[PDB]
Design a protein around this ligand. Sequence first.
Ligand code: HEM
Ligand SMILES: [Fe+3]
Ligand SMILES: [Fe+3]
Lengths: 154, 154, 154, 157, 158, 158, 158
Amino acid sequence: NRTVLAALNDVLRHQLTAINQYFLHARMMKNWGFNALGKHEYKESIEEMKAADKLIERILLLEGLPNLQDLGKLLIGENVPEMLKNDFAMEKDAHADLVKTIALCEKQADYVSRDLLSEFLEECEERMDFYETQLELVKKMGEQNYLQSAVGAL
Amino acid sequence: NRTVLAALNDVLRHQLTAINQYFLHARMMKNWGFNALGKHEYKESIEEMKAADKLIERILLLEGLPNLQDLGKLLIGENVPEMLKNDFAMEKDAHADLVKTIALCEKQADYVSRDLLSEFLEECEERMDFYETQLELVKKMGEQNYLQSAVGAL
Amino acid sequence: XXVXXXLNXXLXXXLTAXXQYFXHARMXXNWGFXXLXXXXXXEXXXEXXXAXXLIXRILXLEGXPXXXXXXXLXIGXXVPXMXXNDXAXEXXXXXXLXXXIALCEXXXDYXXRXXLXXXLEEXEXXXXXXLXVXXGXXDXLXXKNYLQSXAXXX
Amino acid sequence: XXXXXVXXXLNXXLXXXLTAXXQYFXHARMXXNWGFXXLXXXXXXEXXXEXXXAXXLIXRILXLEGXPXXXXXXXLXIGXXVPXMXXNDXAXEXXXXXXLXXXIALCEXXXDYXXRXXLXXXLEEXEXXXXXXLXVXXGXXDXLXXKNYLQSXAXXX
Amino acid sequence: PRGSPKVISVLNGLLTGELTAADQYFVHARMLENWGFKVLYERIEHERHDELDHAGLLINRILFLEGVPDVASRAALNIGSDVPKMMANDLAYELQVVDELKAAIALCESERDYDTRRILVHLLEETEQDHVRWLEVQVGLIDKLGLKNYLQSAAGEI
Amino acid sequence: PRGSPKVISVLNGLLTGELTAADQYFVHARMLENWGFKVLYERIEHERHDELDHAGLLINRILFLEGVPDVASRAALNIGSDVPKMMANDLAYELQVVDELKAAIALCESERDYDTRRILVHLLEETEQDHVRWLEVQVGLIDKLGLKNYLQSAAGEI
Amino acid sequence: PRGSPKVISVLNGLLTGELTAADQYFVHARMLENWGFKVLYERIEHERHDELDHAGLLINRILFLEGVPDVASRAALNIGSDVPKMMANDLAYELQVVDELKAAIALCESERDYDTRRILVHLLEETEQDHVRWLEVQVGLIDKLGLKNYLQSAAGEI
Ligand code: HEM
Ligand SMILES: [Fe+3]
Ligand SMILES: [Fe+3]
């Protein structure tokens, strides 16, 4: 199907944009000395990386062309809370498009694509819950305490 | 210096384009069952990704913002030798720009950046030699024998 | 002879750096900040190693290491003060190192150039970086939170 | 709070130790440059020991709410040859030992006993691990002959 | 123990041949690695190390006999343009080494110089087995497998 | 990966220097072991192996630059008649090698060829801090310990 | 397995030579141990044990050839009063043994006694490499290191 291939290319573009955004954010966190948070976002970028790899393999098996050239807009924040907010917003948009794509794959009887996208949606909503929890923790513990927690060791 | 950071960002854009091209080529190599060449391409993508990580460290250390948004034109091959030629061309251009950036870093006395770029140039030159050797192997062994070797474990 | 003089200057710089790092580390350990103390002790050890390398290089060049001439020690009274003083000293040392590497390149002495490049890497991407990080963190975390992180286990 | 006199004497002892450490380092690297690897290793060990001693002294000075003077350093009597280096080291160490004896007396007088314990430990270290070894080295340079002693100091080639 | 001047002369000729063969194997192994024929590269590397050990044994024998090794003099290097050419050149040099080694062994036997005869016999066995046999086998394999199949077997795992 | 012709020529000169150094080290180590100086023999043999590795690196760089190497050409061998003459000859050759290496590094920097400059800086580091300084230490030790004590230390165990 | 009477005679002569060598090495090892030269004593004792093994092989070869071993006879022992004299005496005797071994190898090749030729060639290899080479190296080291340094080396740890 052409429509399934186009939707998969769109989801892959979100995957690539998320990989780049998470790697940049993790590198900025490491540059600022936030070792725990930066290491978490590095692991998150690696997870995004594996998910994108799986999506590329899926698109290739469907005899489609993975469009790795195009990327989305990168929401790069100047501080840790704004970086968390930007990551959360990107995850929300990706989750909405992922839900639309899963509905399309169910409509088009592409069921292994649907299973792969359901795994992606599970991981994406896990990330969404983590980022909303982090924003709530920023509010509750305070920015200073949250940044101290993000630093980890000295 | 503005020019040193600009040249570092150009090198980073080349490296990210190389990452995407290498991973895409490895994925379509695994899709065709060319396991040995696919694994080698995968490890080259990993090496380029670690190098981009190191360069992002360097750019962030210089109080400069990395540009992960942009991406050079991708060179995707329809067949294994075409991928080899496109890889060789991309590495040739990346190596010329790397040499220019190393010279510029020498002019501005950014010796740590120059050392990092020299290490990157060593990687780029070994990759260039590998791809030239692979193309000569395609010429000598022939397409059928070289593809059988690229298959590796069936 | 100019290369030997430059190397002796850099040696005096490194010896002063070590003598300041040690004093700062012991004051920080006296105050109870065990983590910062351990870090600064490691830094002092690294500086001693670098100074030793400088001495060995000067001796291999048929020279006389001025291991008696030391510069002014900028000792701090509070952890932020020591951090800032250390950053200042390291910045000055890096400038001196850049000048010395340029001279070594001009004087066609490439071995001492390589040694000095290694020292510059150790200074910029391991000492100046860490101190800049800590200076930013003592502001992003607050003085109290940063000191609590520095005290380790109390 | 420690006394003014005690902190002063301790800062003096610290300056002595710092100069000793620097001199020992310079000498060890010179010996390494000459190829006397065994003597170089020995002198490096001695320099490390002196560094540890200076660190202990700094800690003690800090505990007494006094400010350590790690910017002051005595003259570096550096030898041009191995026997010269040995003699210079011995002289410096003897001076340091005399100063330490005076400091121990002052600490005992000023009722500072932890400081005196530290100083006495440093005195045993400086008379045994240092002055004794250097005296032995000079004696052996005279007994073995300079050539045989240097061959022994080179160790392996 | 002074050896025969003729024995030392032929030992020096043998040493010159062995050093020239070591250098030729050096060049050939490096060009094989540059081309990507890794298996041939490792084999020629081991052959070059064997030639270095042979030259060392010859030098030790010459120095024992109170001679002066002629390590400065070298023979003309025959560097092939492609894999079959280098294999043929290696085989040709090995056969010439065999001929000169047989002549030297006969001379050592005629001179009642039997320890050097033992070393030269060991060298001749190493040359016939490890070098001449392997290179003639390689030529036969190029003839049988064909050029492309042999090059694929030589390239190893890509 | 086409290389510059001046860079290729300077690399061939450096490679010829390193091959001649390897030959001289081979002869010196073999005569040192013939005389029973085991410690010196092991050190000079390790130096010869290191020079072989240097020549390998240089040949690989030359081949990668699409230029033919030069291994048939060999420089003059200076062979001493005893241990101090060995040390003097090796130190002089290593100093000459260092000067040529510095000239080649300047040329590589001028021509914006940085990988060869990196290899040559590695080679210069190795030559200065493992060959030049060791030989200088050896001559100083001969001066200080005297001839007989240095020879006793070089003989090691008997 | 009848052997030529000439072959058995030269085997008996070689056996007499090796037995006398064993006696001389025994006395020299004991004298070196008495004088305190532990290193030299250990080496000379190892040489004596190796010569006893050599005599064992010779006796087995003689008995296999259906010949009577002449183990009663012993040549004259040359005993030195100091380390250089013992080294010189051992070197002279080993050179004499080398002459006898070469003559016996020539005879065995003439008589078509090829297994005897092989064991005698192994004997000559052992004598020229382990024994003659070491004693010549020791004489050279006495010349180079001097007498006092050589004796200090031979004493070892005290
Ligand atoms: C854009 C598409 C990308 C894809 C499809 C991709 C894919 C992958 C995969 C499959 C892995 C292996 C994960 C593992 O072994 O744990 C990986 C790891 C990694 N990637 Fe990505 N990646 C991409 C982008 C990037 C970028 C842009 C960077 C840096 C700027 C990067 C840096 C890394 C690093 C540092 C690793 C870890 C290497 C290691 O564990 O040895 N990646 N990537
Ligand atoms: Fe070299
Ligand atoms: Fe002695």
